[PDB]
Amino acid sequence: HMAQQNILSVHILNQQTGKPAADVTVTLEKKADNGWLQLNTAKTDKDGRIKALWPEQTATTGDYRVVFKTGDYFKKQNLESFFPEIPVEFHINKVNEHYHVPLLLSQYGYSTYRGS
Amino acid sequence: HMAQQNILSVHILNQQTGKPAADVTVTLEKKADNGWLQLNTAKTDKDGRIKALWPEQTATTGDYRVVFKTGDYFKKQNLESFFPEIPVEFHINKVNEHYHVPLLLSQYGYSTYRGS
Amino acid sequence: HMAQQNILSVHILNQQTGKPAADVTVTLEKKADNGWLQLNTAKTDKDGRIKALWPEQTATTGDYRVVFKTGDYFKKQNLESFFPEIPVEFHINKVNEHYHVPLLLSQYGYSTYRGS
Amino acid sequence: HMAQQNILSVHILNQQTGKPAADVTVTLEKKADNGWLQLNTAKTDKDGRIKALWPEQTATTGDYRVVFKTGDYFKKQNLESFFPEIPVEFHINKVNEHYHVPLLLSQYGYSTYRGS
């Protein structure tokens, strides 16, 4: 979890093709009083990654949420999915280390975790 | 996915113990016009299940989300987790079918899918 | 409620369609003095299950292996897979309880765990 | 971007600690006429990786198998596991590409897939 230039990265692996899920919209939100505030929005590259998802601003500890717009990813291929989108809520307790959040994606199932 | 009785059930399996996650609070919300609206809340039984999570009202097609309060579950075990809670957003396309949503839970990773 | 049932069952769920993988061959082997001994072989039913996989012999605490012949399953769907077959090695600690081994299947990825 | 590296790498992530699984023995075997033959054995580094698992010999398309000795890994932490070891069988159909096989590990459940 050693620090990188940006505190947050994500990676989407299409378990059905064995290849990265490219051009997938992913948003980042910060938890506030009862609601959520959007910090950024980006699209995964040809390798299904967003190496720098946090906006170019000072980060703070607290609860956050990344929302993978995978339902749209599949709909664009005319494929159905049980999940319209996949929100992953997590906690950042140290702003001096890196957080990598991969998503192993299938149409009717998925896995996510804090990567290394 | 034939209709049974209550349209929604969930099950939490602790992958670190190979045993069910009991007494975990789970909320159900509906994606409505003006945002999300809570439909019901219950706790997993001794077997880590909630056999009938839908409230007493006709379900409609649309987006929903169950939120597993797993952060508090691990806390009671003197364990930390990357996720304060785990939201799972899903879509009901046919109201005449049963929906089962299992959660395979670990402190820093999880899996979910549409069960049988 | 499975205590008086056959000690070993499996279930294969296709995460790309959200439906069971039927008619898939699954073998059961027992770990012995340097090597493996095949105890049985069966095919998943229409619900992607094998209710009673344990053969007519006294079970003993030790290591075993179930091999899901998923490569052939995918070929029948005209799909390629990273795995020719999927072996899962597990340990039986008590011969007086039920063991359920589920398989969450995708073409290039899978998950398994001790069923609850 | 891994095209100029050794052709086979693995990575083990402990989903219970959210950290890499270090010093874990991993073997590599090739399937041939007279059964399986071992090709190499190595141990994951401090980052839970084995960057170059393929030995100094010409690689040939076909079926292979890596076995993660995870049962021993947990035992050292005074923890039990449903799996004595975790074998992963896969096909190499193009030796001009890199193959990465990650393992998401928990005591009673795991996931593996073709990485990127």
Write the Ramachandran bin of A23: left for phi over 0, alpha for psi from -120 to 50, otherwise beta: left
Q: Using CA atoms, how far apart are residues D28 and B74, in angstroms rounded to an integer?
A: 37
Please, which experimental method was used? X-ray
User: D65: annotated binding-site residue?
Assistant: no
Write the Ramachandran bin of B79: left for phi over 0, alpha for psi from -120 to 50, otherwise beta: beta
Residue in C98, C96, C28, C97 with CA at minimum distance from that of residue C63: C28
Q: Quick one: DSSP state of residue B48?
A: S
C-alpha A63, offset from chain centre = 14
Q: List beta partners, residue C102.
A: C11
Please give the domain boundaries of chain C with CATH numbers for all domains: 1-116 (2.60.40.180)
CB contacts < 8 A, A to D, total 29
C-alpha C89, offset from chain centre = 10
Show which of residues 25-54 on chain D sit within 8 Å of chain A, judged by CB atoms. Answer: 47-48
DSSP string, A40-55: EEEE--TTSEES--S-
Q: Using CA atoms, how far apart are residues A103 and D73, in angstroms rounded to an integer?
A: 25
Give the closest-approach CA distance of D20 to chain A in angstroms. 7
User: C11: annotated binding-site residue?
Assistant: yes
Sequence-distant (≥ 6) Cβ neighbours of residue A91 within 8 angstroms: A62, A63, A64, B71, B81, B82, B83, B84
Residue C41, Cβ density class (10 Å: 0-12 exposed, 13-18 middle, ≥19 buried): middle
Please report which helix (H) or strand (E) contains residue D8, including its range.
Answer: strand D8-14
Q: Using CA atoms, how far apart are residues B63 and C53, in angstroms rounded to an integer?
A: 39
- Catalogue the E-assigned strands of chain B: 8-14, 19-20, 25-32, 35-43, 49-50, 62-68, 86-92, 99-105, 109-113
Q: Using CA atoms, how far apart are residues A79 and A14, in angstroms rounded to an integer?
A: 13
Beta strand pairing call for C99-106 and D99-106: unpaired
Give contacts of B82 with chain D, Cβ < 8 Å: 18
Check CB contact under 8 Å for D82 and C108: no
Q: Using CA atoms, how far apart are residues D20 and D11, in angstroms rounded to an integer?
A: 8
Check CB contact under 8 Å for B106 and D17: no
Question: Which residue has tokens 């992958």?
Answer: B15
The reply to whether B111 touches chain D by the CB within 8 Å rule is yes
Check CB contact under 8 Å for B89 and A83: yes
Amino acid found at C23: D
DSSP string, D94-116: -TTS-EEEEEEEETTEEEEE---
Q: Using CA atoms, how far apart are residues C83 and C112, in angstroms rounded to an integer?
A: 14
Q: List beta partners, residue D30.
A: D37, D64
Closest-CA residue of C relative to A110 is C15
